Design a protein around this ligand. Structure first.
Ligand SMILES: [Zn+2]
Length: 214
């Protein structure tokens, strides 16, 4: 989704990167949007809790806004690597194309690109590709990762230390499902199978076990 908000956020990120103070006017200039439009948009983002306007009037991304800004720059740069490395688009066109693709590239495509690209260190233009750690290239909660259709996946964390109920502990041990294991999930209650042993989980386990997509 080509968010106006994702464009303001990546712009702030970009200026910061250049060592420029993210003032509203520089942002207006960079986005070729009038001062009145940027105030409008910034006022909105503030309500969304994505940016605060500092004492010196500069814009400061909140942790949630920074995270989203980083995700966008990551997508932008992965798209550029894709564009030059595989597609072979004219180098002179690459940045403008990626500016559009950054809004519609999913996290899944990005994981694939980290896999097929020979190097995701920098963009073709000399800047490091950020947010790779957060892309996961800990993990998605089983509750969010399982679906009506089973699929294998990797166990990242069992989080038993956070468990109040422990009667499922030995099931996991018997089904040889530990951290770093490749099991198969599915929504139905959620049941993660492995070692030929299906393990149906209770709310608490499903809400705390994290699995990295295979
Ligand atoms: Zn670019």
């Amino acid at each position: 989704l080509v968010d106006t908000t994702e464009m303001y956020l990546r712009t702030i990120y970009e200026l910061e990167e250049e060592g420029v103070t993210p003032l509203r006017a520089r942002i207006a200039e960079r986005l070729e949007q009038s001062g009145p439009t940027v105030s409008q948009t910034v006022a909105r983002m503030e309500r969304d809790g994505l940016v605060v306007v500092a004492s010196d009037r500069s814009l400061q991304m909140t942790p949630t806004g920074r995270t989203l800004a980083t995700a966008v720059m990551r997508k932008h740069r992965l798209a550029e690597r894709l564009l030059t490395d595989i597609i072979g688009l004219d180098i002179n066109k690459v940045h403008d194309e990626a500016c559009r693709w950054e809004h519609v590239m999913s996290d899944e495509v990005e994981r694939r690109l980290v896999k097929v690209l020979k190097d995701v260190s920098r963009s073709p233009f000399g800047n490091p590709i950020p947010g790779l750690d957060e892309l996961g290239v800990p993990g998605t909660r089983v509750i969010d990762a399982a679906t009506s259709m089973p699929r294998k996946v990797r166990i990242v964390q069992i989080n038993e230390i956070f468990q109040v109920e422990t009667d499922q502990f030995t099931q996991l041990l018997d089904a040889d499902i530990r951290v770093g294991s490749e099991v198969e999930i599915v929504d139905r209650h959620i049941t993660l199978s492995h070692n030929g042993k299906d393990v149906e989980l209770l709310d608490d386990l499903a809400h705390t076990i994290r699995i990295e997509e295979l």
